[PDB]
């Protein structure tokens, strides 16, 4: 969970070579779904990021 009440669990795991990746190669640690944003109204999470 975050510091904003976004509790959740791990669905599955991936390695880097099929994790998505950005131009500098910063491969992310973890990906959460966008739909947890609007209905939860958790703006400060985004601001923190």
């Amino acid at each position: 969970a975050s510091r904003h009440g976004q509790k959740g669990t791990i669905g599955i795991t991936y390695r880097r070579e099929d994790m998505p990746f950005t131009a500098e190669g910063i491969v992310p640690d973890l990906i959460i779904n966008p739909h947890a944003i609007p209905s939860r109204m958790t703006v400060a999470h985004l601001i923190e990021c």
């Binding site: 500098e24 190669g25 910063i26 491969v27 992310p28 640690d29």
Partner: protein, 66 residues
Amino acid sequence: MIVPVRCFSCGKVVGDKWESYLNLLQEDELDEGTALSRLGLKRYCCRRMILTHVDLIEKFLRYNPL
């Protein structure tokens, strides 16, 4: 705790750099952002670990076991 080995994101070895990053802030009086730059960590996934790791190991170490 020690510095981690091996940044979780990227994989570059970190841990050689720790005491260097310390003495960059002890006598060289240097700003820390430039300290990491001069240490040579230009991606930021690597940069977060040195900048946020806390060293509890010596606070452990000040006991007297055996």
